[PDB]
Amino acid sequence: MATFYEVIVRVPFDVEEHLPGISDSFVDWVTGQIWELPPESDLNLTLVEQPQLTVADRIRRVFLYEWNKFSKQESKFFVQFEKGSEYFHLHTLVETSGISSMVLGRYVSQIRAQLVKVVFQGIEPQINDWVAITKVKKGGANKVVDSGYIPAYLLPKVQPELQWAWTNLDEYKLAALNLEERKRLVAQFLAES
Ligand SMILES: [Cl-]
Ligand SMILES: [Zn+2]
Ligand SMILES: [Zn+2]
Numbered sequence: 001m002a003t004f005y006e007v008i009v010r011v012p013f014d015v016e017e018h019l020p021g022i023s024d025s026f027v028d029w030v031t032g033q034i035w036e037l038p039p040e041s042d043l044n045l046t047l048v049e050q051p052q053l054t055v056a057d058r059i060r061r062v063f064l065y066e067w068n069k070f071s072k073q074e075s076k077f078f079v080q081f082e083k084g085s086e087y088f089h090l091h092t093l094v095e096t097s098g099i100s101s102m103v104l105g106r107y108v109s110q111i112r113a114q115l116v117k118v119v120f121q122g123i124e125p126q127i128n129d130w131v132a133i134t135k136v137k138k139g140g141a142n143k144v145v146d147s148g149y150i151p152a153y154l155l156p157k158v159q160p161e162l163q164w165a166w167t168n169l170d171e172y173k174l175a176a177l178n179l180e181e182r183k184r185l186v187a188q189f190l191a192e193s
Contacts, residue, residue, distance in 0.1 A: 001146040002169075005094040005101075005107055006134040009115075011056050011081075011088040014127035022123045030054045038162065039179035047159040052088045056081045058119050060166060063092060066111045078167040078176075080154045087127065088163065091154060092147070103143045108133055130173035144183065147171075151189040155182040 012018035015027065023050055028152060031047050033054040037045050067075055081088070112131040118120045134143045147169075154165075156174055165176040175181040 001148060002147055003123055003144050004076075004078075005099065005104060005142055006090040006145060006149075007063075007094070008132050008134060009059055009090040009092060009131040010127045011052055011059065012092065012127055012130065013052050013055050013088070018125050018127055019120060019123050020126065022148050026121065038177060040174065042179050043157055043162075043177055047127070048163055049088065050084075051080060053164055055092055055119065056088065056145065056164070057166075059115055060090060060092070062115055062118050063111055064078075064094070066114045067094055067099075067107075067114060071095075073098060074168070076169055076171055078154065078165070078172055079166040081084065081162050081163040082157060082161050084161070093150070093154075096144060099106070101144075104142050108144045130133055143193050148189070151185045155189075156186050 001072075013030065019026065023035065030051040033043070033050065035048065035050050035053055037043055042188060055134070060081075064077060071094075075097065078093045078156055080091045108131060115131070116122060135141065136143050150169075155172075158179065167173060167176050172185075175185055
């Protein structure tokens with residue numbers, strides 16, 4: 001099956017705790033963006049934190065576009081935005097094609113720098129390891145997972161942990177924002193294992 005790298009991005013949004021020194025334009029931006037559920041979604045919008053989602057989507061797009069620069073293709077991805085116990089964060093799965101594991105660190109470092117400039121007005125987020133490549137173990141190699149990781153680990157999340165998801169993988173397009181479809185794929189995954 002298709003192989004992917006996973007980068008978890010903790011989403012900064014608090015001007016005191018995460019982004020000291022940022023201008024008013026940040027709060028104005030995240031406060032003014034209205035989100036609507038697509039017709040095919042069955043999510044409860046009241047459980048979705050829009051200001052954080054606004055930052056998350058921008059991070060996702062900037063990350064992917066920068067990744068495409070390195071992969072030199074429209075890389076396949078599955079990105080899931082979640083409200084964790086400590087941080088809102090993105091599980092960013094991007095296919096390995098065109099990106100060697102030894103150079104991934106430098107690439108992701110460059111992507112982080114781009115995020116700081118574009119999304120955060122040059123302000124460094126005060127969150128520990130806010131852009132982290134998932135490793136096999138501490139100090140180990142960059143973890144590589146296949147498509148199965150999606151239905152096995154990401155699709156099972158429900159609201160409010162699950163906040164939103166995006167993908168250009170046809171197999172998961174419907175599942176991204178549909179709990180019933182996620183339920184179907186999770187069931188299918190268990191049956192096959
Ligand atoms: Cl967390
Ligand atoms: Zn591809
Ligand atoms: Zn998570």
